[PDB]
Amino acid sequence: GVKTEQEDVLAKELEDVNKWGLHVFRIAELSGNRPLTVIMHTIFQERDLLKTFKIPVDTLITYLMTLEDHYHADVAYHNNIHAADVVQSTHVLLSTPALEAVFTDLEILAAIFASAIHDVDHPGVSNQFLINTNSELALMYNDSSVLENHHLAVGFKLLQEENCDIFQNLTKKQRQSLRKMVIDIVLATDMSKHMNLLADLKTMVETKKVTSSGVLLLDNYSDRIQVLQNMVHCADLSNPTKPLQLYRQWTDRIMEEFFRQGDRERERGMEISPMCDKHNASVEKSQVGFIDYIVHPLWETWADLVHPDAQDILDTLEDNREWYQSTIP
Ligand SMILES: COc1ccc(C2=NN(C(C)C)C(=O)C2(C)C)cc1OC1CCCC1
Ligand SMILES: [Mg+2]
Ligand SMILES: [Zn+2]
């Protein structure tokens, strides 16, 4: 009734679960490709979510196992490892000193559950690819946030599988509030909403208020959900803020996925999407452009909101940016 030796090495890696820079690829290897299940289980136990929401542990494991199985093992980036990474990154952001005692257990559950489902059943191609190919998903969702609508529908539908309803003991009021917040968070992961999310986060930093020394005041749903939306969006765009050994693995995987979409586009005689042409590729320049135009403006604004809690992450992002710049030939 004590762990195998592989389960021990996994348990020792999972001691890093509260730190930016977890060996998530090593956790994927040690868990038999179960990073999402073991990281979600660890976070739920750590935050006492099973007791708070009366989640039977067998139901939690069955749902997590089912959810993880609906991420595609043949997709290089948008897979269970990326889901596990965004969950664990959201978990660390929720622990930021500037947000201590700000969020309810229901809001914490929403942010973590949203992170876990936010890319489920991703086919490894973009919304524009799905729209241009007249795919069933684009037709179901009227070409609007096709993938993000689909991730939500699958994440919720999987609750109806045998012993998978982890919310079975929540009141209707709790379930309606959880459901609305999860939908609002995952729809905000659509990059077409990035500029509006960032504009609203900047407005909040300019008008920010702190109460009882240090900790953010968020007194309406609009502000509370905007911060959770930006938090999970930051977690989703967190790769360039990680130690470079992790960042380079994420860059290899996103480039494999993008080049594969570009190959699908070229073989069909479609216009090849930005950064998807492996014959016309500038990986280093693209990463510097990605950091300069998207990731740095977002994380700089987040860093202001929670000043100074995110200084080390912003420092790592700036170091990684200089490393990629220095390798442009
Ligand atoms: C590790 O590096 C990355 C991780 C995620 C992304 C994404 N890009 N986008 C949009 C903006 C196209 C997205 O939705 C996501 C967030 C999936 C991009 C990355 O870097 C690439 C940009 C151009 C080539 C290298
Ligand atoms: Mg997504
Ligand atoms: Zn994602």
mmCIF file of C-alpha atoms and ligand atoms in Angstrom:
data_model
loop_
_atom_site.group_PDB
_atom_site.id
_atom_site.type_symbol
_atom_site.label_atom_id
_atom_site.label_comp_id
_atom_site.label_asym_id
_atom_site.label_seq_id
_atom_site.Cartn_x
_atom_site.Cartn_y
_atom_site.Cartn_z
ATOM 1 C CA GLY A 1 0.000 0.000 0.000
ATOM 2 C CA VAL A 2 2.978 2.372 -0.755
ATOM 3 C CA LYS A 3 3.976 3.835 -4.179
ATOM 4 C CA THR A 4 5.975 1.956 -6.927
ATOM 5 C CA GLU A 5 9.477 3.522 -7.528
ATOM 6 C CA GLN A 6 8.214 5.358 -10.703
ATOM 7 C CA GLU A 7 5.292 6.831 -8.587
ATOM 8 C CA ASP A 8 7.950 8.011 -6.014
ATOM 9 C CA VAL A 9 10.041 9.874 -8.691
ATOM 10 C CA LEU A 10 6.710 11.431 -9.964
ATOM 11 C CA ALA A 11 5.751 12.470 -6.363
ATOM 12 C CA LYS A 12 9.202 14.154 -5.947
ATOM 13 C CA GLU A 13 8.789 16.142 -9.262
ATOM 14 C CA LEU A 14 5.213 17.157 -8.085
ATOM 15 C CA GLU A 15 6.833 18.934 -5.052
ATOM 16 C CA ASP A 16 7.576 21.703 -7.675
ATOM 17 C CA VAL A 17 3.778 22.129 -8.399
ATOM 18 C CA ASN A 18 3.684 25.615 -6.702
ATOM 19 C CA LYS A 19 6.694 26.902 -8.704
ATOM 20 C CA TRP A 20 7.008 28.620 -12.098
ATOM 21 C CA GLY A 21 9.270 26.238 -13.987
ATOM 22 C CA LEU A 22 7.829 22.751 -13.129
ATOM 23 C CA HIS A 23 9.456 19.877 -15.165
ATOM 24 C CA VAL A 24 6.075 19.248 -16.890
ATOM 25 C CA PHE A 25 7.633 17.150 -19.751
ATOM 26 C CA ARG A 26 9.343 14.918 -17.128
ATOM 27 C CA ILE A 27 5.958 14.620 -15.267
ATOM 28 C CA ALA A 28 4.339 13.561 -18.608
ATOM 29 C CA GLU A 29 7.018 10.817 -19.025
ATOM 30 C CA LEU A 30 6.883 9.572 -15.371
ATOM 31 C CA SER A 31 3.002 9.485 -15.241
ATOM 32 C CA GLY A 32 2.673 7.308 -18.425
ATOM 33 C CA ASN A 33 1.390 10.365 -20.391
ATOM 34 C CA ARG A 34 -0.996 11.417 -17.498
ATOM 35 C CA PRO A 35 0.374 14.919 -16.727
ATOM 36 C CA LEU A 36 -3.124 16.558 -16.686
ATOM 37 C CA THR A 37 -4.650 13.895 -14.342
ATOM 38 C CA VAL A 38 -1.719 13.872 -11.821
ATOM 39 C CA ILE A 39 -1.267 17.711 -11.831
ATOM 40 C CA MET A 40 -5.079 18.376 -11.512
ATOM 41 C CA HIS A 41 -5.309 15.729 -8.712
ATOM 42 C CA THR A 42 -2.320 17.318 -6.847
ATOM 43 C CA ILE A 43 -3.823 20.848 -7.196
ATOM 44 C CA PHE A 44 -7.332 19.690 -6.084
ATOM 45 C CA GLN A 45 -5.819 17.944 -2.950
ATOM 46 C CA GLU A 46 -3.479 20.971 -2.225
ATOM 47 C CA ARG A 47 -6.400 23.512 -2.439
ATOM 48 C CA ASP A 48 -8.775 21.095 -0.565
ATOM 49 C CA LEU A 49 -11.294 21.277 -3.494
ATOM 50 C CA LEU A 50 -12.544 17.626 -3.002
ATOM 51 C CA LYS A 51 -13.726 18.457 0.597
ATOM 52 C CA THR A 52 -15.025 21.958 -0.286
ATOM 53 C CA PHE A 53 -17.149 20.753 -3.285
ATOM 54 C CA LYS A 54 -17.812 17.174 -1.986
ATOM 55 C CA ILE A 55 -16.159 15.627 -5.087
ATOM 56 C CA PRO A 56 -15.813 11.814 -4.702
ATOM 57 C CA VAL A 57 -12.110 11.047 -5.462
ATOM 58 C CA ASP A 58 -13.023 8.119 -7.848
ATOM 59 C CA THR A 59 -15.347 10.508 -9.816
ATOM 60 C CA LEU A 60 -12.519 13.123 -10.021
ATOM 61 C CA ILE A 61 -9.974 10.532 -11.281
ATOM 62 C CA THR A 62 -12.503 9.031 -13.791
ATOM 63 C CA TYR A 63 -13.362 12.486 -15.211
ATOM 64 C CA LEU A 64 -9.683 13.628 -15.379
ATOM 65 C CA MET A 65 -8.723 10.344 -17.119
ATOM 66 C CA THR A 66 -11.624 10.854 -19.598
ATOM 67 C CA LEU A 67 -10.782 14.568 -20.175
ATOM 68 C CA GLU A 68 -7.059 13.759 -20.732
ATOM 69 C CA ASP A 69 -8.013 10.949 -23.227
ATOM 70 C CA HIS A 70 -9.926 13.593 -25.351
ATOM 71 C CA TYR A 71 -6.703 15.567 -25.900
ATOM 72 C CA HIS A 72 -5.049 14.169 -29.103
ATOM 73 C CA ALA A 73 -1.702 12.382 -28.439
ATOM 74 C CA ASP A 74 -0.793 12.978 -32.184
ATOM 75 C CA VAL A 75 -0.972 16.836 -31.824
ATOM 76 C CA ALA A 76 2.493 18.239 -30.986
ATOM 77 C CA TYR A 77 1.467 21.396 -29.013
ATOM 78 C CA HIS A 78 -2.334 21.504 -28.248
ATOM 79 C CA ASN A 79 -2.296 18.254 -26.225
ATOM 80 C CA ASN A 80 -2.680 17.096 -22.570
ATOM 81 C CA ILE A 81 0.851 18.397 -21.746
ATOM 82 C CA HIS A 82 -0.128 21.974 -22.756
ATOM 83 C CA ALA A 83 -3.413 21.600 -20.742
ATOM 84 C CA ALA A 84 -1.425 20.389 -17.677
ATOM 85 C CA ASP A 85 1.018 23.336 -18.126
ATOM 86 C CA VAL A 86 -1.776 25.978 -18.331
ATOM 87 C CA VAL A 87 -3.514 24.419 -15.270
ATOM 88 C CA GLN A 88 -0.241 24.505 -13.222
ATOM 89 C CA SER A 89 0.622 28.057 -14.458
ATOM 90 C CA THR A 90 -2.938 29.272 -13.521
ATOM 91 C CA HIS A 91 -2.430 27.592 -10.095
ATOM 92 C CA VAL A 92 0.827 29.599 -9.505
ATOM 93 C CA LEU A 93 -0.793 32.898 -10.739
ATOM 94 C CA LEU A 94 -3.790 32.348 -8.330
ATOM 95 C CA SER A 95 -1.218 32.119 -5.422
ATOM 96 C CA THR A 96 0.277 35.613 -6.239
ATOM 97 C CA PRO A 97 0.604 37.697 -2.987
ATOM 98 C CA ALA A 98 -1.343 40.633 -4.591
ATOM 99 C CA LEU A 99 -4.416 38.277 -4.993
ATOM 100 C CA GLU A 100 -4.249 36.633 -1.494
ATOM 101 C CA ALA A 101 -7.848 36.004 -0.200
ATOM 102 C CA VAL A 102 -9.339 37.902 -3.230
ATOM 103 C CA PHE A 103 -11.082 34.940 -5.005
ATOM 104 C CA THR A 104 -13.754 32.519 -3.663
ATOM 105 C CA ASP A 105 -13.279 28.701 -3.834
ATOM 106 C CA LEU A 106 -15.922 28.685 -6.671
ATOM 107 C CA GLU A 107 -13.843 31.251 -8.689
ATOM 108 C CA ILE A 108 -10.638 29.205 -8.006
ATOM 109 C CA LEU A 109 -12.450 25.992 -9.185
ATOM 110 C CA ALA A 110 -13.675 27.915 -12.312
ATOM 111 C CA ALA A 111 -10.163 29.158 -13.242
ATOM 112 C CA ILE A 112 -8.543 25.689 -12.754
ATOM 113 C CA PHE A 113 -11.378 23.698 -14.461
ATOM 114 C CA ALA A 114 -11.373 26.253 -17.344
ATOM 115 C CA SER A 115 -7.560 25.777 -17.713
ATOM 116 C CA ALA A 116 -7.918 21.950 -17.727
ATOM 117 C CA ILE A 117 -10.613 21.882 -20.519
ATOM 118 C CA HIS A 118 -9.531 25.028 -22.454
ATOM 119 C CA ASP A 119 -8.042 23.174 -25.511
ATOM 120 C CA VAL A 120 -9.740 19.705 -25.201
ATOM 121 C CA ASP A 121 -10.200 17.782 -28.530
ATOM 122 C CA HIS A 122 -7.974 20.379 -30.378
ATOM 123 C CA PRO A 123 -7.330 19.015 -33.912
ATOM 124 C CA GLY A 124 -3.943 20.870 -34.258
ATOM 125 C CA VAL A 125 -5.186 23.442 -36.867
ATOM 126 C CA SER A 126 -6.509 27.021 -36.413
ATOM 127 C CA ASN A 127 -10.056 28.446 -36.501
ATOM 128 C CA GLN A 128 -9.267 30.086 -39.893
ATOM 129 C CA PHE A 129 -8.151 26.697 -41.252
ATOM 130 C CA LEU A 130 -11.444 25.124 -39.997
ATOM 131 C CA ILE A 131 -13.465 28.049 -41.528
ATOM 132 C CA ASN A 132 -11.622 27.967 -44.934
ATOM 133 C CA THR A 133 -11.995 24.144 -45.278
ATOM 134 C CA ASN A 134 -15.792 24.280 -44.612
ATOM 135 C CA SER A 135 -15.283 21.897 -41.636
ATOM 136 C CA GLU A 136 -18.207 20.607 -39.523
ATOM 137 C CA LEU A 137 -16.897 22.449 -36.406
ATOM 138 C CA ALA A 138 -16.910 25.816 -38.256
ATOM 139 C CA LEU A 139 -20.511 25.094 -39.479
ATOM 140 C CA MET A 140 -21.705 24.075 -35.928
ATOM 141 C CA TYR A 141 -20.333 27.331 -34.356
ATOM 142 C CA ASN A 142 -21.074 29.749 -37.297
ATOM 143 C CA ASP A 143 -17.318 30.430 -37.732
ATOM 144 C CA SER A 144 -17.235 32.288 -34.385
ATOM 145 C CA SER A 145 -14.628 31.114 -31.772
ATOM 146 C CA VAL A 146 -15.017 27.625 -33.328
ATOM 147 C CA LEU A 147 -12.349 25.795 -31.338
ATOM 148 C CA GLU A 148 -13.044 27.584 -28.007
ATOM 149 C CA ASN A 149 -16.833 26.824 -28.298
ATOM 150 C CA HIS A 150 -15.892 23.190 -29.045
ATOM 151 C CA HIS A 151 -13.411 22.886 -26.089
ATOM 152 C CA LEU A 152 -16.211 24.104 -23.726
ATOM 153 C CA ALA A 153 -18.879 21.768 -25.214
ATOM 154 C CA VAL A 154 -16.570 18.697 -24.896
ATOM 155 C CA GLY A 155 -15.293 19.596 -21.374
ATOM 156 C CA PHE A 156 -18.929 19.859 -20.116
ATOM 157 C CA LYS A 157 -20.340 16.896 -22.173
ATOM 158 C CA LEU A 158 -17.677 14.545 -20.674
ATOM 159 C CA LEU A 159 -19.305 15.131 -17.232
ATOM 160 C CA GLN A 160 -22.253 12.882 -18.422
ATOM 161 C CA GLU A 161 -19.921 9.822 -18.858
ATOM 162 C CA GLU A 162 -20.071 6.942 -16.307
ATOM 163 C CA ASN A 163 -18.952 8.248 -12.853
ATOM 164 C CA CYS A 164 -17.664 11.528 -14.367
ATOM 165 C CA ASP A 165 -19.953 14.222 -12.835
ATOM 166 C CA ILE A 166 -17.441 15.962 -10.501
ATOM 167 C CA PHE A 167 -20.048 18.747 -9.847
ATOM 168 C CA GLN A 168 -22.802 16.260 -8.738
ATOM 169 C CA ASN A 169 -22.909 17.711 -5.115
ATOM 170 C CA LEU A 170 -22.895 21.444 -6.087
ATOM 171 C CA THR A 171 -26.204 23.376 -5.731
ATOM 172 C CA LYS A 172 -27.892 24.621 -8.919
ATOM 173 C CA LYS A 173 -26.755 28.185 -7.912
ATOM 174 C CA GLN A 174 -23.096 27.006 -7.588
ATOM 175 C CA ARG A 175 -23.351 25.092 -10.959
ATOM 176 C CA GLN A 176 -24.852 28.102 -12.842
ATOM 177 C CA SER A 177 -22.149 30.490 -11.488
ATOM 178 C CA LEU A 178 -19.310 27.950 -12.154
ATOM 179 C CA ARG A 179 -20.650 27.293 -15.686
ATOM 180 C CA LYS A 180 -20.919 31.010 -16.604
ATOM 181 C CA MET A 181 -17.377 31.774 -15.324
ATOM 182 C CA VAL A 182 -15.848 28.729 -17.137
ATOM 183 C CA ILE A 183 -17.527 29.754 -20.415
ATOM 184 C CA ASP A 184 -16.360 33.418 -19.979
ATOM 185 C CA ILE A 185 -12.732 32.260 -19.269
ATOM 186 C CA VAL A 186 -12.368 29.710 -22.133
ATOM 187 C CA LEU A 187 -13.998 32.066 -24.755
ATOM 188 C CA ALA A 188 -11.388 34.699 -23.668
ATOM 189 C CA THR A 189 -8.552 32.278 -24.818
ATOM 190 C CA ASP A 190 -9.538 33.054 -28.465
ATOM 191 C CA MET A 191 -6.588 35.258 -29.674
ATOM 192 C CA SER A 192 -9.116 37.419 -31.581
ATOM 193 C CA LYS A 193 -10.140 38.743 -28.108
ATOM 194 C CA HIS A 194 -6.547 39.510 -26.992
ATOM 195 C CA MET A 195 -6.473 43.264 -27.869
ATOM 196 C CA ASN A 196 -9.843 43.961 -26.051
ATOM 197 C CA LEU A 197 -8.771 41.859 -22.972
ATOM 198 C CA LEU A 198 -5.414 43.768 -22.824
ATOM 199 C CA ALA A 199 -7.199 47.174 -23.279
ATOM 200 C CA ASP A 200 -9.513 46.288 -20.321
ATOM 201 C CA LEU A 201 -6.601 44.983 -18.177
ATOM 202 C CA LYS A 202 -4.704 48.327 -18.834
ATOM 203 C CA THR A 203 -7.859 50.350 -17.840
ATOM 204 C CA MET A 204 -8.026 48.308 -14.584
ATOM 205 C CA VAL A 205 -4.285 48.969 -13.814
ATOM 206 C CA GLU A 206 -4.854 52.770 -14.412
ATOM 207 C CA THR A 207 -7.946 52.756 -12.016
ATOM 208 C CA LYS A 208 -6.617 50.018 -9.688
ATOM 209 C CA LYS A 209 -7.481 50.124 -5.954
ATOM 210 C CA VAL A 210 -5.868 48.167 -3.063
ATOM 211 C CA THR A 211 -7.574 47.460 0.320
ATOM 212 C CA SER A 212 -6.414 46.260 3.795
ATOM 213 C CA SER A 213 -2.774 46.853 2.548
ATOM 214 C CA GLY A 214 -1.498 45.522 -0.842
ATOM 215 C CA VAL A 215 -4.357 43.245 -2.086
ATOM 216 C CA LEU A 216 -6.457 44.137 -5.216
ATOM 217 C CA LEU A 217 -10.070 45.383 -4.725
ATOM 218 C CA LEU A 218 -12.465 43.700 -7.244
ATOM 219 C CA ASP A 219 -16.067 44.506 -6.142
ATOM 220 C CA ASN A 220 -18.161 43.588 -9.284
ATOM 221 C CA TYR A 221 -18.361 40.491 -11.554
ATOM 222 C CA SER A 222 -17.058 42.445 -14.591
ATOM 223 C CA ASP A 223 -13.720 43.174 -12.828
ATOM 224 C CA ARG A 224 -13.446 39.754 -11.071
ATOM 225 C CA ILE A 225 -14.031 37.793 -14.383
ATOM 226 C CA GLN A 226 -11.758 40.196 -16.402
ATOM 227 C CA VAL A 227 -8.866 39.362 -13.979
ATOM 228 C CA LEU A 228 -9.592 35.569 -14.158
ATOM 229 C CA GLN A 229 -9.865 35.814 -18.011
ATOM 230 C CA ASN A 230 -6.494 37.690 -18.229
ATOM 231 C CA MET A 231 -4.945 35.262 -15.678
ATOM 232 C CA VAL A 232 -5.778 32.130 -17.762
ATOM 233 C CA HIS A 233 -4.839 34.047 -20.988
ATOM 234 C CA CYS A 234 -1.409 34.811 -19.327
ATOM 235 C CA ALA A 235 -1.079 31.099 -18.385
ATOM 236 C CA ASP A 236 -1.938 30.168 -22.023
ATOM 237 C CA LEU A 237 0.764 32.660 -23.298
ATOM 238 C CA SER A 238 3.264 31.709 -20.487
ATOM 239 C CA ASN A 239 5.768 29.608 -22.592
ATOM 240 C CA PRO A 240 8.216 32.524 -23.302
ATOM 241 C CA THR A 241 8.236 33.398 -19.525
ATOM 242 C CA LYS A 242 9.520 29.916 -18.549
ATOM 243 C CA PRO A 243 13.172 28.790 -18.163
ATOM 244 C CA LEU A 244 14.634 28.529 -21.709
ATOM 245 C CA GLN A 245 14.906 24.641 -21.647
ATOM 246 C CA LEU A 246 11.041 24.581 -21.267
ATOM 247 C CA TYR A 247 10.403 27.495 -23.744
ATOM 248 C CA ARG A 248 12.494 25.792 -26.493
ATOM 249 C CA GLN A 249 10.477 22.518 -26.127
ATOM 250 C CA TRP A 250 7.199 24.528 -26.485
ATOM 251 C CA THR A 251 8.655 26.406 -29.520
ATOM 252 C CA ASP A 252 9.668 23.055 -31.173
ATOM 253 C CA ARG A 253 6.102 21.708 -30.603
ATOM 254 C CA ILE A 254 4.193 24.830 -31.813
ATOM 255 C CA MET A 255 6.471 24.952 -34.935
ATOM 256 C CA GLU A 256 5.833 21.201 -35.628
ATOM 257 C CA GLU A 257 2.054 21.857 -35.352
ATOM 258 C CA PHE A 258 2.156 25.074 -37.501
ATOM 259 C CA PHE A 259 4.420 23.461 -40.201
ATOM 260 C CA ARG A 260 1.959 20.477 -40.288
ATOM 261 C CA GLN A 261 -0.963 22.936 -40.869
ATOM 262 C CA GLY A 262 1.202 24.670 -43.556
ATOM 263 C CA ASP A 263 1.828 21.256 -45.251
ATOM 264 C CA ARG A 264 -1.979 20.578 -45.186
ATOM 265 C CA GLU A 265 -2.569 24.102 -46.680
ATOM 266 C CA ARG A 266 0.189 23.710 -49.401
ATOM 267 C CA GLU A 267 -1.009 20.190 -50.473
ATOM 268 C CA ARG A 268 -4.609 21.654 -50.891
ATOM 269 C CA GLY A 269 -3.251 24.766 -52.751
ATOM 270 C CA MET A 270 -4.585 27.065 -49.941
ATOM 271 C CA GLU A 271 -2.744 30.259 -48.886
ATOM 272 C CA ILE A 272 -0.144 29.090 -46.253
ATOM 273 C CA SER A 273 -0.941 30.775 -42.870
ATOM 274 C CA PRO A 274 1.575 33.107 -41.134
ATOM 275 C CA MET A 275 4.660 31.192 -39.707
ATOM 276 C CA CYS A 276 3.297 27.816 -41.107
ATOM 277 C CA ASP A 277 5.679 27.625 -44.167
ATOM 278 C CA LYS A 278 8.677 25.389 -43.169
ATOM 279 C CA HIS A 279 10.421 26.478 -46.486
ATOM 280 C CA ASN A 280 9.983 30.233 -45.610
ATOM 281 C CA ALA A 281 10.499 30.067 -41.772
ATOM 282 C CA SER A 282 12.284 32.492 -39.387
ATOM 283 C CA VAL A 283 11.597 30.804 -35.968
ATOM 284 C CA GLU A 284 13.890 33.231 -33.978
ATOM 285 C CA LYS A 285 12.461 36.440 -35.615
ATOM 286 C CA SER A 286 8.865 35.062 -35.134
ATOM 287 C CA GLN A 287 9.510 34.396 -31.367
ATOM 288 C CA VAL A 288 10.912 37.979 -30.981
ATOM 289 C CA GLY A 289 7.837 39.353 -32.854
ATOM 290 C CA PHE A 290 5.509 37.185 -30.696
ATOM 291 C CA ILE A 291 7.160 38.468 -27.474
ATOM 292 C CA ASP A 292 7.344 42.153 -28.644
ATOM 293 C CA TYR A 293 3.728 42.486 -29.989
ATOM 294 C CA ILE A 294 1.696 39.992 -27.809
ATOM 295 C CA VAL A 295 3.421 38.322 -24.815
ATOM 296 C CA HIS A 296 5.457 41.277 -23.381
ATOM 297 C CA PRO A 297 2.640 43.903 -23.564
ATOM 298 C CA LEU A 298 0.336 41.371 -21.765
ATOM 299 C CA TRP A 299 2.837 40.251 -19.072
ATOM 300 C CA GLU A 300 4.095 43.867 -18.527
ATOM 301 C CA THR A 301 0.437 44.855 -17.824
ATOM 302 C CA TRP A 302 -0.142 41.772 -15.587
ATOM 303 C CA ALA A 303 3.158 42.649 -13.740
ATOM 304 C CA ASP A 304 1.799 46.212 -13.065
ATOM 305 C CA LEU A 305 -1.534 44.784 -11.733
ATOM 306 C CA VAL A 306 0.276 42.507 -9.189
ATOM 307 C CA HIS A 307 3.453 44.722 -8.736
ATOM 308 C CA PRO A 308 5.975 43.494 -7.770
ATOM 309 C CA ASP A 309 4.964 39.754 -7.634
ATOM 310 C CA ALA A 310 5.668 39.062 -11.382
ATOM 311 C CA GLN A 311 9.100 40.820 -11.658
ATOM 312 C CA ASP A 312 11.037 37.506 -11.885
ATOM 313 C CA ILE A 313 8.711 36.215 -14.666
ATOM 314 C CA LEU A 314 9.034 39.501 -16.638
ATOM 315 C CA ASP A 315 12.887 39.235 -16.135
ATOM 316 C CA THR A 316 12.883 35.637 -17.548
ATOM 317 C CA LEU A 317 10.703 36.801 -20.532
ATOM 318 C CA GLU A 318 13.160 39.708 -21.285
ATOM 319 C CA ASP A 319 16.179 37.299 -20.989
ATOM 320 C CA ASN A 320 14.506 34.743 -23.366
ATOM 321 C CA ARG A 321 13.687 37.601 -25.797
ATOM 322 C CA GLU A 322 17.416 38.668 -25.849
ATOM 323 C CA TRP A 323 18.505 35.016 -26.349
ATOM 324 C CA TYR A 324 16.229 34.639 -29.479
ATOM 325 C CA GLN A 325 17.286 38.120 -30.839
ATOM 326 C CA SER A 326 20.998 37.093 -30.423
ATOM 327 C CA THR A 327 20.382 33.944 -32.621
ATOM 328 C CA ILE A 328 18.751 35.810 -35.608
ATOM 329 C CA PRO A 329 21.331 35.181 -38.441
HETATM 330 C C1 LIG B 1 5.988 28.697 -27.739
HETATM 331 O O1 LIG B 1 5.636 29.686 -28.695
HETATM 332 C C2 LIG B 1 4.312 29.909 -28.971
HETATM 333 C C3 LIG B 1 3.221 29.441 -28.249
HETATM 334 C C4 LIG B 1 1.921 29.748 -28.648
HETATM 335 C C5 LIG B 1 1.692 30.544 -29.776
HETATM 336 C C6 LIG B 1 0.347 30.908 -30.247
HETATM 337 N N1 LIG B 1 0.220 31.654 -31.302
HETATM 338 N N2 LIG B 1 -1.110 31.983 -31.416
HETATM 339 C C7 LIG B 1 -1.567 33.013 -32.403
HETATM 340 C C8 LIG B 1 -1.050 34.381 -31.989
HETATM 341 C C9 LIG B 1 -1.131 32.636 -33.807
HETATM 342 C C10 LIG B 1 -1.906 31.281 -30.569
HETATM 343 O O2 LIG B 1 -3.114 31.266 -30.545
HETATM 344 C C11 LIG B 1 -0.989 30.501 -29.642
HETATM 345 C C12 LIG B 1 -1.156 31.007 -28.204
HETATM 346 C C13 LIG B 1 -1.272 28.993 -29.745
HETATM 347 C C14 LIG B 1 2.785 31.018 -30.501
HETATM 348 C C15 LIG B 1 4.088 30.711 -30.113
HETATM 349 O O3 LIG B 1 5.133 31.195 -30.868
HETATM 350 C C16 LIG B 1 4.906 31.064 -32.299
HETATM 351 C C17 LIG B 1 4.406 32.376 -32.848
HETATM 352 C C18 LIG B 1 4.873 32.368 -34.282
HETATM 353 C C19 LIG B 1 5.877 31.270 -34.436
HETATM 354 C C20 LIG B 1 6.210 30.863 -33.034
HETATM 355 MG MG MG B 2 -6.947 27.425 -27.407
HETATM 356 ZN ZN ZN B 3 -4.069 26.835 -24.977
#
